[PDB]
């Protein structure tokens, strides 16, 4: 969502999000670092192709044609420069000139040193408490985004980790149709479609980058939770990692984990969908967690088996029509977990990524809330690892990522919503070590 420089009436009125970098002659002189060679302000490139019929409300939702309902001029940086103002480097590059190559390694959380485990956890909690230096977050839709006077932007500061939650919520929220209207729910800009894996990849990349700037530790990397153990229990659910069960309320996190102190954001859906407002930075309840806890559906009371990862990784097509949660022989739909691990669709089956979510039977098992549980990071870095193994084995075959008629938000050239600057699914559909500056220390079945 948007840089605090662009959360102004001037930027919103002119639809131009092109903040200065180093304005030495005065304001406006170095938009996108044009004075240096770093980039230029220019038109926003948005997807123009058709989406599936499932969404009938074109013209009504600000996530259509993202980000054009807010801005149509943005930064484009040259070469390997990057950033909302071209002030940083593309993933994998560092140095003032973005010419020094960088590669970090994401390891299994359970292989980290006791000092690195403590570090990761203190880093997360610091993320949860630290104001995000760049991004501010909308509380109203674009109709209302400049306040009743048209001069008060409807934005709040938000923490580094609450922004990670908020974007995920904003990618998934119902489309508001009007007070007394039933908000429209057959849309998902980050799930149930091919953009799933690329959306969550960029989601995790942005957190990692943010936590690197927060810690001032360029080599900081996100660990992963290997959940394909077929375990009855959640082996990262201990007071030195993520937190174990609270002995006083079995659905809460142990008071001897700092994650028992976290307060979630974005759980007031009925406010959002009846008033036409957005999730803001006011937190409320505590995390709920209850691994293997949903007695009603035994299918989600055990984590994915190792052979699930093995099997989904032999599904050789990235996706298949209708490019939705009912797609068969789709690796994307399989690892997401609406298909069984062989690729066979079943409306009754939940597997791999979705099974891991529902196994927590709590905040992490609800789509609008789940990043509130920090297991989400590790659940999703492991997912991105699986993805990144698939990109390795099938030579990053993007030919199956459909250029048109996917669910709205999931066509290849769609700017993943609501990431800023605009970034398409294509820019993520690359092998991580040589294109994104990170790699996974990880061993697969056979
Ligand atoms: C890119 O955006 C420009 C600014 O529009 C803003 O951004 C959009 C994303 C959207 O959010 C919109 O609601 C925002 O206002 C657009 O430039 C504007 O274009 C107007 C005409 O198309 C223009 O107007 C002028 O002329 C009429 C005369 O009939 C007057 O009524 C008016 O007062 C203005 O003088 C307006 O000035 C102009 N803004 C500029 C140039 O900064 C631009 O069209 C748009 N391009 C796209 C979407 O392709
Ligand atoms: C942030 O979101 C919360 C929750 O959606 C808003 O709090 C609600 O405010 C309305 C009107 O005052 C009431 O229903 C309650 O007081 C709140 N709801 C709940 C569930 O607590 C809050 O006002 C929002 N912040 C802004 C600036 O709009
Ligand atoms: C966690 O699991 C519990 C039960 O195992 C869920 O609670 C049941 O949900 C059904 C809906 O299918 C309700 O009809 C029952 O009344 C609930 N019973 C009990 C005892 O809770 C609960 O919804 C799950 N929560 C999450 C977040 O997954
Ligand atoms: C966020 O914090 C600033 C100070 O950094 C505060 O003055 C302001 O009210 C907030 N700005 C926005 C855009 O929310
Ligand atoms: C997938 O869902 C769409 C619409 O819900 C439908 O066209 C298609 O038949 C579904 N796939 C099935 C039922 O296997
Ligand atoms: N609702 C999904 C499971 N799920 C839960 C929470 C999520 O964040 C997510 O991405 C998926 C399902 O129906 O299986
Ligand atoms: Zn350009
Ligand atoms: Zn998600
Ligand atoms: Zn998920």
UniProtKB/Swiss-Prot annotation:
Q: In which tissues is it expressed?
A: Pigment cells.
Cofactor comment text: Contains bound zinc ions after heterologous expression in insect cells, giving rise to a protein that lacks DHICA oxidase activity.
**Processing and modification events after translation:** Glycosylated.
Q: Which UniProt keywords apply?
A: Albinism, Copper, Disease variant, Disulfide bond, Glycoprotein, Melanin biosynthesis, Membrane, Metal-binding, Monooxygenase, Oxidoreductase, Signal, Transmembrane, Transmembrane helix, Zinc
Residues with an annotated glycan are: 72, 80, 157, 280, 326, 361
* Top-level taxon in the UniProt lineage: Eukaryota
Q: Which residues bind Zn(2+) A?
A: 168, 191, 200
Q: Which Cys pairs does UniProt list as disulfide-bonded?
A: 6-17, 18-41, 32-75, 77-86, 89-98, 234-237, 266-279
Question: What controls its activity?
Answer: The activity depends critically on the nature of the bound metal ion. Catalyzes the oxidation of 5,6-dihydroxyindole-2-carboxylic acid (DHICA) in the presence of bound Cu(2+) ions, but lacks activity in the presence of bound Zn(2+) ions.
Subcellular location per UniProt equals: Melanosome membrane
Q: Which residues lie on this side of the membrane: Lumenal, melanosome?
A: 1-446
Q: Which cofactor does it need?
A: Cu(2+); Zn(2+)
Q: In which pathway does it act?
A: Pigment biosynthesis; melanin biosynthesis
Where does this protein chiefly localize? membrane
> Is the keyword Membrane assigned to this protein?
yes
UniProt membrane topology term = Single-pass type I membrane protein
Enzyme Commission designation: 1.14.18.-
Q: Which GO terms describe its biological process?
A: acetoacetic acid metabolic process; melanin biosynthetic process; melanocyte differentiation; melanosome organization; positive regulation of melanin biosynthetic process
Q: What does this protein do?
A: Plays a role in melanin biosynthesis. Catalyzes the oxidation of 5,6-dihydroxyindole-2-carboxylic acid (DHICA) into indole-5,6-quinone-2-carboxylic acid in the presence of bound Cu(2+) ions, but not in the presence of Zn(2+). May regulate or influence the type of melanin synthesized. Also to a lower extent, capable of hydroxylating tyrosine and producing melanin.
Concerning its family, UniProt says:
Belongs to the tyrosinase family.
* Associated disease: Albinism, oculocutaneous, 3: An autosomal recessive disorder in which the biosynthesis of melanin pigment is reduced in skin, hair, and eyes. Tyrosinase activity is normal and patients have only moderate reduction of pigment. The eyes present red reflex on transillumination of the iris, dilution of color of iris, nystagmus and strabismus. Darker-skinned individuals have bright copper-red coloration of the skin and hair.
Listed under subunit, the entry gives: Monomer. Interacts with ATP7A. Interacts with SLC45A2.
Name the chain's protein.
Answer: 5,6-dihydroxyindole-2-carboxylic acid oxidase
The record lists the organism as Homo sapiens
Covered residues of the complete protein? 25 to 470 of 537
